[PDB]
Design a binder for this molecule. Structure first.
Ligand SMILES: [Zn+2]
Length: 126
C-alpha cells in the first residue's frame, strides 16, 4: 500500500532519471511498512542524498526525524545501487531510531530486524 509511518519521501531533483530514483525510494518505503508497524517506528522524512564522502551510505538525523539514503553509486551517478543493498542500509538506519552507538544493543536489534523483514517479505504481510 502506502506506508503510513513515513510522512514524506523525496529524491534529489537535479540528478538524472529522478523518476526511477523516486520509484526506488518509494519501493523501499513500501517494503518496510509492516516492520515499522510492528516496531512502532516512525520516520518523518525519507530522502535521497549523494554525499561527496563515498563511505556514507545512509544517515539517521534525530532518531527518525530524517533518514537519508544513498541511491546512486558514488562513482557513477547514473547507476543505482542494488535494491538489496539499499534495504540493508534502511534497516541499519531504522535501528538508529532506538540505538545511537554501534554497540551490542544496536547489533542485536538489527539482527532481529533483518530476520523479521525477510519473513515479512516471504509471507507478504503489510
Ligand atoms: Zn549506523
Amino acid at each position: 500500500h502506502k506506508n503510513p509511518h513515513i510522512q514524506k519521501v523525496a529524491v534529489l531533483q537535479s540528478k538524472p532519471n529522478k523518476e526511477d530514483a523516486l520509484n526506488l525510494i518509494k519501493e523501499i518505503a513500501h517494503k518496510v511498512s509492516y516492520l515499522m508497524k510492528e516496531n512502532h517506528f516512525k520516520v518523518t522524512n525519507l530522502v535521497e542524498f549523494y554525499p561527496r564522502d563515498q563511505r556514507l551510505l545512509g544517515m539517521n538525523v534525530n532518531h527518525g526525524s530524517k533518514i537519508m539514503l544513498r541511491l546512486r553509486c558514488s562513482t557513477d551517478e547514473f547507476q543505482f545501487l542494488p535494491m538489496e543493498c539499499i534495504m540493508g542500509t534502511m534497516l541499519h538506519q531504522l535501528t538508529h531510531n532506538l540505538f545511537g552507538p554501534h554497540d551490542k544493543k544496536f547489533y542485536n536489534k538489527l539482527d532481529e530486524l533483518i530476520g523479521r523483514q525477510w519473513v515479512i517479505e516471504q509471507r507478504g504481510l503489510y
